[PDB]
Structure formats: structure tokens, C-alpha cells
Amino acid sequence: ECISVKGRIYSILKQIGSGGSSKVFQVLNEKKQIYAIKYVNLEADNQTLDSYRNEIAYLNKLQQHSDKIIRLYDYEITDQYIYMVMECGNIDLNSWLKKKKSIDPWERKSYWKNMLEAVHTIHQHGIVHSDLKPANFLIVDGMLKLIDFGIANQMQPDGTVNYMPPEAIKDMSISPKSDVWSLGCILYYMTYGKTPFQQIINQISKLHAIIDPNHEIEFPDIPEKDLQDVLKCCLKRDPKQRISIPELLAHPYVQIQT
Numbered sequence: 001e002c003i004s005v006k007g008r009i010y011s012i013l014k015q016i017g018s019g020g021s022s023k024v025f026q027v028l029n030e031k032k033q034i035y036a037i038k039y040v041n042l043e044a045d046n047q048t049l050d051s052y053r054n055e056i057a058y059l060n061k062l063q064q065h066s067d068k069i070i071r072l073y074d075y076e077i078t079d080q081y082i083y084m085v086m087e088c089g090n091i092d093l094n095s096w097l098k099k100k101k102s103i104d105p106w107e108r109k110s111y112w113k114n115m116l117e118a119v120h121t122i123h124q125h126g127i128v129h130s131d132l133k134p135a136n137f138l139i140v141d142g143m144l145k146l147i148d149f150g151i152a153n154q155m156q157p158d159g160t161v162n163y164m165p166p167e168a169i170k171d172m173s174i175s176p177k178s179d180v181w182s183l184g185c186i187l188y189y190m191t192y193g194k195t196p197f198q199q200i201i202n203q204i205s206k207l208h209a210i211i212d213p214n215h216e217i218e219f220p221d222i223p224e225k226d227l228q229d230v231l232k233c234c235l236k237r238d239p240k241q242r243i244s245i246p247e248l249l250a251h252p253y254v255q256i257q258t
């Protein structure tokens with residue numbers, strides 16, 4: 001019911017996430033301010049460990065570079081456990097997406113800008129998140145912020161190959177373009193109400209479909225003509241043909257307000 005980090009005590013309001021020996025708690029400090037504490041039980045290969053160490057260091061470093069990256073106020077690391085005190089936000093994008101029926105065009109555009117800026121920041125520092133999904137983004141102050149960089153083991157709020165890029169499947173035996181496809185699927189869902197290959201319930205079929213150039217993705221007409229173009233450009237199977245993050249930041253959909 002209580003946790004301590006660097007001589008500071010927090011009260012466990014509730015658990016909001018879980019994973020491989022890892023938990024996320026909604027907490028309050030002495031002055032009743034709210035924060036998110038990530039607990040990691042280190043009793044974990046030399047490698048799983050180094051993966052958490054790497055994530056912590058990049059998250060910390062990347063703090064200064066963008067307000068679209070989640071805030072890490074402090075952390076406690078020992079041979080037994082890891083405690084991470086960070087911004088708590090309102091709710092993760094994945095949970096919020098399920099509760100809302102329709103999404104506002106302005107909100108969708110603002111959110112897309114946030115995601116783009118966050119992924120852009122991590123790319124400039126040589127990080128390619130490799131598993132991008134809505135659960136990786138947190139809604140804080142009517143704005144989206146990136147929670148993790150996909151370096152450490154992934155957690156889930158309290159998996160699917162829907163957002164999986166084709167190059168990652170073909171290369172079965174790394175480019176920043178992979179994050180573009182994933183972002184495209186998130187925006188596609190934000191626009192059409194589902195991921196491009198959501199219907200395929202058969203997984204090996206879904207996989208074959210994601211990679212097959214003959215399997216055409218549906219882009220039914222909409223009033224925002226730019227959005228439709230963004231989606232088309234983001235969902236190019238060939239990574240070389242696929243639009244880049246710097247190009248997406250200069251796209252009319254993001255640049256020109258309607």
C-alpha cells in the first residue's frame with residue numbers, strides 16, 4: 001500500500017499495468033500529487049537486464065528533447081528491483097480508443113502531430129521503436145506522449161500483429177520506415193474504425209495479406225482528402241516507397257488547417 005523512492009513515500013492508488021516481472025501503479029506523494037510508478041522485479045537474464053538499463057538511460061536522456069516524450073522525474077535501481085517515477089497522464093490511447101465511438105477530426109489531427117513529433121525525436125537519436133501501437137501512447141493534457149521506446153520488454157494497461165510492418169515479416173530468418181507503417185495503422189484505425197487487416201481472423205492469412213502487394217487495402221472516400229493521402233503513403237508495403245517522418249511533418253494534412 002506504500003512505496004519509497006529516493007527518500008520519498010507514495011501511496012498506491014491502484015495498479016494500471018503489468019508484464020514480465022513488471023507492474024505500473026497509480027500513486028500519490030506527500031502533497032497528494034499524482035504520478036506513475038513502474039516496478040520491475042529483478043529476480044532476468046544478463047540481457048533482459050541490460051535492456052531495462054538501456055531504456056532507462058535513453059528515456060532520461062530524451063527528456064530534454066521533446067515534451068511529447070513521457071516525463072521521468074526519478075528512479076531507483078538495485079540488484080533486486082527497479083522503481084520508476086514518471087508522468088501519470090489521463091489514460092493510454094488504446095483504452096481510450098475502445099471507449100469512444102467516433103473521433104473528432106481536430107483531435108485526430110492534433111494527436112497525429114504529437115505521435116509524429118515523438119517518433120521523430122527517438123529517430124534522431126538512433127532509436128527505432130519496433131512495436132508501435134496505441135498502448136505505447138498516453139493521453140496527458142489533451143495531448144499524446146510516447147511511453148516507451150520498445151527497447152525494454154513491453155507491458156500492457158489494465159498482443160496483436162495488426163500493426164506489424166511487412167518488411168519485418170519478409171525479413172524473417174532495421175529501418176525507421178517501420179515506425180511509419182505502424183503509425184499509419186494507428187491513424188487508419190483513428191479514421192476508419194479498424195486496422196487495415198483487422199478482419200482476417202486467420203493469422204497466417206493476416207500475415208500473408210500484410211505482405212502481399214496484390215492484397216489491396218481499402219481507403220473509402222472521406223472529406224479530409226489529405227488524410228486519405230497520408231494513409232495511402234504510410235501504408236506502402238515497400239519501405240523505400242513509403243513516406244518518411246520528415247516528409248510527413250511537411251504534409252498538407254499536418255501543415256494546412258481546415
Ligand SMILES: CCOc1nc(Nc2ccc(C(N)=O)cc2)cc(N)c1C#N
Pocket residue numbers: 016017018024036038070086087088089090091092095138147155156157158
Ligand atoms: C501500462 C501503462 O503504463 C503507464 N501508464 C501510464 N498511465 C496510465 C496508463 C493507463 C491508464 C488507464 N487506462 O487507466 C491511465 C494512466 C503512465 C505511465 N508512465 C506508464 C508507464 N510506464
